[PDB]
Amino acid sequence: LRNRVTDRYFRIQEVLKHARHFRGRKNRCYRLAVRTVIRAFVKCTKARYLKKKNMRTLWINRITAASQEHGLKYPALIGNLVKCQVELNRKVLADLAIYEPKTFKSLAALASRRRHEGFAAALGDGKEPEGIFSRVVQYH
Amino acid sequence: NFKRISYAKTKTRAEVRGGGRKPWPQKGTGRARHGSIRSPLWRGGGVAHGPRGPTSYYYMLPMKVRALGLKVALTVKLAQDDLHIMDSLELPTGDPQYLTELAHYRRWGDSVLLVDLTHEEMPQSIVEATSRLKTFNLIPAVGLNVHSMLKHQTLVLTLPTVAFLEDKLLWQDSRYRPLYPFSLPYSDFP
Amino acid sequence: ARALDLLRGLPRVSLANLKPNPGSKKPERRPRGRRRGRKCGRGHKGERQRGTRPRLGFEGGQTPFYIRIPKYGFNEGHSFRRQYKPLSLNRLQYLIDLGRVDPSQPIDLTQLVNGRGVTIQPLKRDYGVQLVEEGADTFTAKVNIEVQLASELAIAAIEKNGGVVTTAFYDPRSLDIVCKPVPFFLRGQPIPKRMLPPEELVPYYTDAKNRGYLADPAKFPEARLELARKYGYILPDITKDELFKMLCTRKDPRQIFFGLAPGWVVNMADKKILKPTDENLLKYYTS
Amino acid sequence: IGIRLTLPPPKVVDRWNEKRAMFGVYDNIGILGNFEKHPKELIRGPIWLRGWKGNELQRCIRKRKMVGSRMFADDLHNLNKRIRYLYKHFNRHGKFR
Amino acid sequence: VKKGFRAAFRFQKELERQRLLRCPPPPVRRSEKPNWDYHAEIQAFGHRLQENFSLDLLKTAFVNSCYIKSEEAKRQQLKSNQELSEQGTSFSQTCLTQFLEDEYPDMPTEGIKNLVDFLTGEEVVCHVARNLAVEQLTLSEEFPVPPAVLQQTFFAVIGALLQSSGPERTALFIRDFLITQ
Amino acid sequence: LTYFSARKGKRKTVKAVIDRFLRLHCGLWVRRKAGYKKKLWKKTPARKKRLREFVFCNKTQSKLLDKMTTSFWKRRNWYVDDPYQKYHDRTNLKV
Amino acid sequence: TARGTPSRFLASVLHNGLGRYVQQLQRLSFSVSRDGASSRGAREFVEREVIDFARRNPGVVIYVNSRPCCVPRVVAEYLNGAVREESIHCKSVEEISTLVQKLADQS
RNA sequence: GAAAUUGGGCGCAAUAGAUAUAGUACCGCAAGGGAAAGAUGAAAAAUACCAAGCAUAAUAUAGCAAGGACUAACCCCUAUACCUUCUGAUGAAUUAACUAGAAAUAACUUUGCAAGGAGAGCCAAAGCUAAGACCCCCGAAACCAGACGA
RNA sequence: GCCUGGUGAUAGCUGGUUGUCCAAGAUAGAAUCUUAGUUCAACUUUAAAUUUGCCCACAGAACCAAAUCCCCUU
RNA sequence: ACCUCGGAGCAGAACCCAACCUCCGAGCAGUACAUGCUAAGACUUCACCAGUCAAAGCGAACCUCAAUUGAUCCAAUAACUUGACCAACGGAACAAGUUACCCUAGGG
Ligand SMILES: [Mg+2]
Ligand SMILES: [Mg+2]
Ligand SMILES: [Mg+2]
Ligand SMILES: [Mg+2]
Ligand SMILES: [Mg+2]
Ligand SMILES: [Mg+2]
Ligand SMILES: [Mg+2]
Ligand SMILES: [Mg+2]
Ligand SMILES: [Mg+2]
Ligand SMILES: [Mg+2]
Ligand SMILES: [Mg+2]
Ligand SMILES: [Mg+2]
Ligand SMILES: [Mg+2]
Ligand SMILES: [Mg+2]
Ligand SMILES: [Mg+2]
Ligand SMILES: [Mg+2]
Ligand SMILES: [Mg+2]
Ligand SMILES: [Mg+2]
Ligand SMILES: [Mg+2]
């Protein structure tokens, strides 16, 4: 052996500090721990996409539930709040739903009022006065 | 590296002892197919690509590059303020401690390379003083190289060695390509 | 220089500061890791991965390119053909101008070697120098050259200016002693006699038109007169000027060096010349 | 666990040894001693590789022709087989041709 | 026996770390470890909080009475803390009652007394003074610094800030460290 | 070919290559055309004129022939009355 | 990964922005070899940048130890008694400046 | 594939290096094959922490055994083991150690010198000299020579 | 037969080829005792020199469908 | 049954395009003896090897067909030239059957 490898405890231990919490021999036997540790890191990076996705569906569940408390449905609320130029997002609406339910009730009132003006406006067709909450603020 | 010769050798799978016949048959056993007990996979087998024999690392740079290397070492020692020129290496006494005290007083350095013109005509005092010191080394002017000018912090020439080095190194500039080696006789060389 | 003045301010150059010129050392590529080795550059398992690709030229079974083609003798007698290094007159004027070839002496082949004007190698069967007409206009030198071949226009360009050309012959042995004479006088042998040309070259060196060294010195004024008429210059007589005694000197055939004789042993060490006085040796060396 | 538990004894190196202090002297014996010796006549080693560098097949060929007559019997035999192997390897195997 | 030194050194220090995790030493005070200049670090404690002190007065704010007694127990082989801590706790009690009577006018005074006795409790004040580097500068007898002692040094530091730069800056100090609790 | 001989450890030339081809110093290999002296009775004179020609070689044929000879064959040759001597240096290329 | 590592909630030390802002970094401890190639950028940091740095925030007390080390370190200590030891091994002065300002800015 | 001619260690350090502590033990009728292994200290007239495997400490619905997480180990959600061979069956109980890219023709990059280069030989119509940088491991049936065997 | 040697036999066949990170990168064929392979080409890669490349409009490309070639402008 | 070369379809309109795909054929004959010599520029069977076309010139007069074929080395010959059903037609200078005794390395 001219130069054989001295510093090999530390290469193993670079892998095995990530495996100490597995089960079975994956927690100790480098050959098994490498496949599981690699595979854990791949899951760990593909899970960033799913973290974002699952938060958003969680918010849609909470906005759906809270808006069904006021008779609205979820598409009605989101649509007719966009149409009022209230560009709050799903995270904030879900957090208002839980922590500030009067603000959420008033947002559901603003969205159902806008929804009815959409109905009455698109029923009596022709030149008429627009709805009060139907007006938009032009930016230039 | 040019003088270097590595004596490292290992044994290949042919040179290691025994291992002439198949250990077990090719197919019938459940073991791996093997051809000798001395193949490089076995504990005790030969080495597949180990060091082979004495190897020499010999190469010559052109002599103009060696000569230019000596020049460059001299200008660098002078520019870094490490060249010192004596008129002769004649000490008032032959003790080592005198020479180390002198080198400490003039702020030379930890290690001094003293260079005299010939080995025969080196004064007895500097020979007795530097033959005992580990870091102050006498060398003839022929012995001057670049590894030992960089190894030593200061370098000390005498005036005859300076004329010698100017002669021997300014010769490589303004000389023809050789017809035959310069050890052979020429019109004007020695 | 500002650069040594930079070297003042920097720490001392040591064996711990040194570094190769960037670009000198390409890094070694070796087959370890994800990129440099899994198949390690051999590709998929075939014959080129196993290591056993057939010899150079093998086209896989059809008859190879370098064998479908008829043998023709381009290189038939290549190592017996004679070669002659060219020396142009542009080159020789160049050597005379820079002090490397002294034109106030005879220019033998030793003087072109010692001025390092022409490198000739007797192995690789160079038989010496041939003069070359390149630079004939703008050649202004009175010279005495001994060159083994010479074109007519090069003879004309030398002989116009008051020069003399002759074409000598040298054996490979003799040529080898001529070019580098000093490693011959360390060989200890007596100076040999140069041999006469072979039968192919005797009609060359016995013609006065190409200034042979075995030709008549009675047919030379006719040839000098003929070139002087052909190329339109009035032929100067070499007899008048002061270099004439220099411009007349030839060494006879069977004499390799100029002032020396065959059979002498040059003693380089104590600067003597040992000459033989036995009659059999004198019959052999003065043959 | 192939790692050592106590750290090894320290490696005391004398940089101002006789060999180290005088390394490299007379490498320029040619260029500033009137070319009477080459530097390759300074190197000591096997007689077949003083001032000569070759790959392994050339080292073996040179060793056989320079010193092979007084080599021992099975060393000579091993060396003949190494030239025979290395011949069959350099000349018939590899990637580039 | 593999030749070399670097893997044996790394492994030597990992063994040192597992020795420190298996049997950790009892915690020593900070002034008995390297990189300590007491004076420089009192000045740093001043500039850290964004105010000025008279440095000798703050120095006496960190000097307990237990430390002098065990110190003179060590002599046989300094102004105390108590005046500044008296002034500091008297002042901080009355200023906390000022703030909490101003911003809660309807509270009973039993409630204000229990709030103020929370914001000057041992739990709160000891939690605050272990993160303002008060404990590191306390000259106490025993380590860790016992909570009654450290309460006393914290209100000594308030007393020193009072004599330094008046009641308004200490009011802002007490506002920014005790009321935010 | 032989990359390292057993006697010298040098490269060897393939002597078929020398026997059939002509290396000009600029790097061009000249050859003779295959079948230039076969069945001339059944070839049209245009074709016979084409076969009696000295034809240059390809780029990869040229590099294959360079690898199969050695540096002796790649060398300047100042022959006396060489027929091919005006074809060694390459005149007037613009790459 | 997150299941291997511990986690915590976002916090301050003593409500660090409410009343006033307090620099959470108490001590730095540089240790720099005098002769040694790894602490070159540390040397040029002590000579150029550490005095300016020491003036830009006086609540931080800085100790430059300058012993024969083989790897130079900086040791940041924080008000809540945390200790971050980072190396400044073979770093330029600019890289050390960004590291020290990084340690200053955090808690 | 000529000839004339020319003229001590940038080693190994107990799977390494010798097969070697020994051609011993063992195996074979025989020729012949052929091992393994030791570690205190100045004195024996001074008797820690670390592989796999386990134990301390068995187990709790669900599923390539994780990841996102989470107050919370599990429960929720996402997720067709690795190598190799195919366009898309093979091998591996596990740990430790050992175990596989060797050539500088030409080109390129970097120096030196430059119509010359090279410390003879060799090349040269900007070349030549020097360096750097490219070419694996295991596995048959066989054939031949000489022994040992009824 | 078996052993030792030649012998590291040979194997176009099977299996295997060990740090990191980035970049560019896939489908015409012709010969061959050749179709389990090689050689040339095509494609691919780097470096270098230069000047056009790609897309395309009129006009144009034979007698006995979809389109393509060619091609200035852009 | 086939193995090389050519024509047509496949593949309708530049080029190219397979098959143990569909149909025809070829392995010559005839005439001329300037079927002399040279030489710009091109095409090209997807490489190479082979193939094709050719103005001007010198010298003279005043080729048809589609395929109609064979490298190198070697022979024969003073020379010019000539030499294979080398048809397995890019051709090894000359080598058959069989093994349920087969054997090994592999593939399905
Ligand atoms: Mg989404
Ligand atoms: Mg053997
Ligand atoms: Mg074998
Ligand atoms: Mg071994
Ligand atoms: Mg061994
Ligand atoms: Mg052994
Ligand atoms: Mg364990
Ligand atoms: Mg599940
Ligand atoms: Mg792998
Ligand atoms: Mg018997
Ligand atoms: Mg093999
Ligand atoms: Mg094969
Ligand atoms: Mg990419
Ligand atoms: Mg064939
Ligand atoms: Mg095959
Ligand atoms: Mg165009
Ligand atoms: Mg083509
Ligand atoms: Mg065939
Ligand atoms: Mg065929």
Experimental method: cryo-EM
Between the CA of A20 and the C1' of H80, what is the distance in angstroms?
26
Report the distance separating Cα C113 and Cα C93, nearest Å: 15
Give domain limits for chain A. Answer: 1-140
| Closest residue in chain A to residue D1, using alpha carbons only | A9
Footprint of strand J on the protein (CB under 7 A): B 26-27, 33; C 59, 61-63, 65, 67-71; F 33-52, 55, 57-58, 61
Instruction: State the CB neighbour count (10 A cutoff) for residue C85.
Output: 18
Question: Residue A55 — φ and ψ, nearest 5°?
Answer: -65, -40
Listing DSSP states for D31-62 in one string gives: TTTTTSS-GGGG--S-GGGSS----HHHHHHH
Per the domain annotation, does E23 fall within a domain? no
> Is nucleic acid strand H under 7 Å from B184's C-beta?
yes
Q: Which residues from B are below 8 Å from C when comparing CB atoms?
A: 75-76, 79-82, 147, 150-151, 153, 176-177, 179-180, 184-186
Contact G73, G81 (CB under 8 A): no
SS3 string of chain G?
Answer: CCCCCCCCCCCCCCCCCCCCCCCCEEEEEEECCCCCHHHHHHHHHHHHCHHHHHHHCCCCEEEECCCCCCCCEEEEEECCCCEEEEECCCCCHHHHHHHHHHHHHCC
- Listing from the earlier edge strand, what are the strands of the sheet with C149-150? C83-88, C126-132, C149-150
* Cis omega (within 30 of 0) for bond into E144: yes
Footprint of strand I on the protein (CB under 7 A): B 12-14, 18, 20-21, 35-36, 48; C 31-40, 42, 45-50, 52-54, 58-62; D 77, 81, 84-85, 88, 97; F 58-60, 64, 95
Report the distance separating Cα B169 and Cα A81, nearest Å: 92
Residues 6+ apart with CB under 8 A from B65: none
Sign of CA dihedral E153, E155, E158, E163: negative
How long is chain C? Answer: 287
A127 touches chain B (CB under 8 A): no
Residues forming a β-bridge with C165: C145
Listing DSSP states for A3-19 in one string gives: S-----HHHHHHHHTSS
Q: Do chains A and C touch (3 or more CB pairs under 8 A)?
A: no
Per the domain annotation, does E20 fall within a domain? no
The strand pair at B136-140 and G83-87 is best described as unpaired
Q: Do chains E and A touch (3 or more CB pairs under 8 A)?
A: yes
Query: Six-digit token pair at E34?
Result: 């390297």
**C6 burial level (CB within 10 Å; 0-12, 13-18, 19+):** exposed
Give domain limits for chain D. Answer: 1-96
Q: How many Å is the maximal CA-CA distance in chain C?
A: 88
User: In Å, how far is B23's CA from the nearest CA of chain D?
Assistant: 23
User: In Å, how far is D93's CA from the nearest CA of chain F?
Assistant: 11
Residue C19, amino acid:
K
Overall CATH class of domain G1-107:
alpha beta
Q: Taking CB atoms and an 8 Å cut-off, how many pairs form between chains C and D?
A: 14
Report the distance separating Cα E178 and Cα G14, nearest Å: 10
For H123, which residue's CA is nearest its C1'? F75
Distances (CA, A) of C277 to C253, C256, C261: 21, 20, 13
Per the domain annotation, does E102 fall within a domain? yes
3-state helix vs strand vs coil in chain D, percent to 5: 45, 0, 55
D24 touches chain B (CB under 8 A): yes
Residue E34, amino acid:
P
Centre of ligand 17 to C-alpha F58, Å, is 14
Show the beta-strand stretches assigned E in C38-163. Answer: 83-88, 126-132, 144-146, 149-150
Listing DSSP states for C9-23 in one string gives: HSPPP-TTS--PPTT
Report the distance separating Cα C226 and Cα C155, nearest Å: 12
Cβ contacts of D94 on chain C, cutoff 8 Å:
51, 53
Q: Is the CB of D7 less than 8 angstroms away from the CB of E8?
A: yes
| Closest residue in chain A to residue G3, using alpha carbons only | A21
Instruction: State the CB neighbour count (10 A cutoff) for residue F40.
Output: 13
Report the distance separating Cα C144 and Cα C166, nearest Å: 8
For I9, which residue's CA is nearest its C1'? D85
Q: Is the CB of B54 less than 8 angstroms away from the CB of D45?
A: yes
Q: Which residues from F are below 8 Å from D when comparing CB atoms?
A: 2-4, 6-9, 67
Centre of ligand 6 to C-alpha D71, Å, is 24
Between the CA of B17 and the C1' of H29, what is the distance in angstroms?
26
Which of strand J's nucleotides are less than 7 A from any protein C-beta? 35-39, 47-54, 63, 69-74, 81-83, 90-91, 104-105
Residues forming a β-bridge with G31: G73
**Which residue pairs, CB below 8 angstroms and at least 24 apart, start in A78-85?**
A79/A111, A79/A115, A80/A110, A80/A111, A80/A112, A80/A114, A80/A115, A80/A118, A81/A107, A81/A110, A81/A111, A81/A114, A83/A114, A83/A118, A83/A134, A84/A110, A84/A111, A84/A114, A84/A133, A85/A136, A85/A137
Neighbours of chain E (3+ CB pairs under 8 A): A, D, G
Query: Which domain covers residue B125, as residue numbers?
Result: 1-190
Distances (CA, A) of E174 to E92, E148, E180, G66: 7, 19, 9, 41
Q: Is the CB of E7 less than 8 angstroms away from the CB of A10?
A: yes
Domain count, chain B: 1
Q: Which of B183, B174, B170, B190 is nearest to B67 (CA)?
A: B170
Question: Which residues lie near ion ligand 6 (Cβ < 5 Å)?
Answer: B 44
Give domain limits for chain G. Answer: 1-107
For J52, which residue's CA is nearest its C1'? F47
**Which residue pairs, CB below 8 angstroms and at least 24 apart, start in B187-190?**
B189/D34, B190/D34
Residues 6+ apart with CB under 8 A from B6: B51, B54, B55, B57
Residue with tokens 């940091």: G45
- Listing from the earlier edge strand, what are the strands of the sheet with G61-64? G61-64, G25-31, G73-78, G83-87
Chain breaks in chain D (C to N over 2.5 A) after: none
Q: Which of C58, E163, E48 is nearest to G79 (CA)?
A: E48
Report the distance separating Cα C166 and Cα C168, nearest Å: 6
Distances (CA, A) of B83 to B69, B100, B152, G105: 16, 17, 11, 51
Residue E83, amino acid:
E
Q: Is the CB of D92 less than 8 angstroms away from the CB of C52?
A: yes
Report the distance separating Cα A104 and Cα A88, nearest Å: 12
Domain count, chain E: 1
Question: Which residues lie near ion ligand 2 (Cβ < 5 Å)?
Answer: B 20
The DSSP secondary-structure symbol of A25 reads G
Q: Which of G61, G65, G80 sits opposite E44 (nearest CB)?
A: G61
Centre of ligand 19 to C-alpha C62, Å, is 8
Residue B113, amino acid:
L
D24 touches chain C (CB under 8 A): no
Report the distance separating Cα C229 and Cα F82, nearest Å: 30
Query: Six-digit token pair at C259?
Result: 């002032």
Q: Which of D81, B158, G58, A62 is nearest to E44 (CA)?
A: G58
Q: Which of E140, E169, E144 is nearest to E61 (CA)?
A: E140
Contact D16, B135 (CB under 8 A): yes
Contact F24, F87 (CB under 8 A): yes
Question: Residue G15 — φ and ψ, nearest 5°?
Answer: 55, 70
Between the CA of C61 and the C1' of J17, what is the distance in angstroms?
27
Instruction: State the CB neighbour count (10 A cutoff) for residue F58.
Output: 11
Centre of ligand 10 to C-alpha B20, Å, is 30
Question: Which residues lie near ion ligand 3 (Cβ < 5 Å)?
Answer: B 35
Report the distance separating Cα G62 and Cα G64, nearest Å: 7
